Amino acid sequence: QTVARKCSLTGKWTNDLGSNMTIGAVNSRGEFTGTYITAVADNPGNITLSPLLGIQHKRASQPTFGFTVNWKFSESTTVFTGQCFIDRNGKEVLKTMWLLRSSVNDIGDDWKATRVGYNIFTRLRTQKE
Amino acid sequence: QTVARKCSLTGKWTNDLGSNMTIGAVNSRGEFTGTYITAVADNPGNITLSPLLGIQHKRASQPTFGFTVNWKFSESTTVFTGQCFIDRNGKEVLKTMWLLRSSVNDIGDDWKATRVGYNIFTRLRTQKE
Amino acid sequence: QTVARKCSLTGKWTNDLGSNMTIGAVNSRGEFTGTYITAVADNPGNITLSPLLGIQHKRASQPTFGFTVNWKFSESTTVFTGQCFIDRNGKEVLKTMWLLRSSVNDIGDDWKATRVGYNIFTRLRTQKE
Amino acid sequence: QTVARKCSLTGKWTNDLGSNMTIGAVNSRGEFTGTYITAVADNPGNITLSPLLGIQHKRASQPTFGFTVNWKFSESTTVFTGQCFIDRNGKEVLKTMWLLRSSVNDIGDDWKATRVGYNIFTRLRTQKE
Secondary structure (H helix, E strand, O other): OOOOOOOOOOEEEEEOOOOEEEEOOOOOOOEEEEEEEOOOOOOOOOOOOEEEEEEEOOOOOOOEEEEEEEOOOOOOEEEEEEEEEEEOOOEEEEEEEEEEEOOOOOHHHHHHHEEEEEEEEEEOOOOOO | OOOOOOOOOOEEEEEOOOOEEEEOOOOOOOEEEEEEEOOOOOOOOOOOOEEEEEEEOOOOOOOEEEEEEEOOOOOOEEEEEEEEEEOOOOOEEEEEEEEEEOOOOOHHHOOOOEEEEEEEEEEOOOOOO | OOOOOOOOOOEEEEEOOOOEEEEOOOOOOOEEEEEEEOOOOOOOOOOOOEEEEEEEOOOOOOOEEEEEEEOOOOOOEEEEEEEEEEOOOOOEEEEEEEEEEOOOOOHHHHHHHEEEEEEEEEEOOOOOO | OOOOOOOOOOEEEEEOOOOEEEEOOOOOOOEEEEEEEOOOOOOOOOOOOEEEEEEEOOOOOOOEEEEEEEOOOOOOEEEEEEEEEEEOOOEEEEEEEEEEEOOOOOHHHOOOOEEEEEEEEEEOOOOOO
C-alpha cells in the first residue's frame, strides 16, 4: 500500500485481543525496550504499562522477533515470539505467540504455573489526508 | 547466610539438556543481558553463544523470570519463561520453558513456524549438598 | 430451533488455515471418532485424512473439547484442545490449539520433537445472519 | 521383565509429578481407552480417575503417541503428546507434554483459557524375571 516489502517494529502496534504495544528504537545489537498495554487479564484490578525488553531481526524481508514483558500490578512474566509478515497487497502484520509464567511458592506447582497463547498485532491507525 | 532462601541469576547455570547460560549483572529496572550456549540444535553446523536479553524478578524468595535469545549461526529467536525454586534442603534450581520461532517466508506457514519446549537449569558447580 | 445458544461438533467444520474436520456422532461417554484433512504440512507429499479420536463436553453452553489426530502419510501425532463459543449475534465458532509430536530416534532429541500452535474452525456452508 | 527395544503402553505407568495412568489394550486401528489419576490440581477438592481416549503408534522402536483426558470433578480437558524412548541401558520412559483447556464463558477470554506443560512417565514397579 505504500512500502514495497519492509518491516520495522519502531513505532506503534495494536492487537485483535485489545492489547497495544509501543516501541521506541531498536539498538544496532538488535535489542529494544518498550511499553505494553493489556486489555485482558486474569485479575484486571489495576492494568498498567508493562515494561518490555527483548530482541528483533531486521535482515530478512519479514523477520522473527521476540521479547519479555515484566508485570507491574501483579508479579508475573510473559514472553512473546513471532514473525512480522507482509500480506499479498503490501499490508503489514505481526503473527506471534505468548507465554505466561505464574509466581508459585513451591517447586511441586511449577507444572500449572506455565501458560501458552497466541496474539496478532497490526500497525495502529496511521490515518491520512 | 548464603544458599538457603535467595535466588539471583547473576553468575552461571547449566541445563540437563547440556545447554549453559551465563549472566553478568541485572539492572535495578530488572532487565539483564547474557551469553547462552546450546548443546542441541535442529542444524548444529556452527553453534555459538547466542546473545540474550530480558527481565527477572528479585522480590520473592523464588521469583519468575524471562528472556529472549537471538541466534547467530541461523536466523531464529527463542524466549525462555520460568521460575527459580529452592528444594526442601536449601538447593537452588531453575524450572523454565522455551519457545522457538522459525523464520518463514510466507504468512501461510506461521502455523508450523512456532515450537514450545521445557528446560531445567542448576547452579554450575556449587559445593556438594 | 437447531441454532440458538447450543454447540455440537457432530457434522462438519472448516479452519481458517484451510484444514477441514468431519465428525460422525459423539458417544454418551463423550468420546468421538472422525476424519481430518490438512491443507498445510511440513512435507505435503501425500496428505490424506488423518483418523481422529478424543472426547467433548456437551453440558455447558459453549463447552471445551479435545482430540488426537494420528497421521497416515508421515508418522506423527497431533492433539487439539479448545472451546466452542457463540459470538454476540448467535454464530458458532471453535477457538482451539494444537500440539504436534515428531517421531525422533533418541531421547536426547525429544526437546525439539514437540511443536505447539493455534487453530480456528467454523460451521462449513453457513447462511446470512 | 523382558524388553530392551520394544514399547507398549498396555499396562501401567507413573509420572514424576505423582500422576498415574493405566491403559487396558490398544485396538488394531491404534486407538485406546484408559484411566488417569492426577496428584496435583488447580482445585484438588475431589480428584477422580479421568477417562482418557486417543491413539498410539507401534511401528517404530520408540514411537510417538497422544490422547485426551476428560475431567470428572471439574469441567476441563487435557491432551497429552509425546514419545516413548529406550535409554542406553534398555530402560523404557515416556517423555510427553500436556495441554489444558479451561471452560470459559466468553470468546473474549479464550486467550487465557489455554495452558501448556510437560510430563515424564515410567513403568510402574516391575517384577523380576
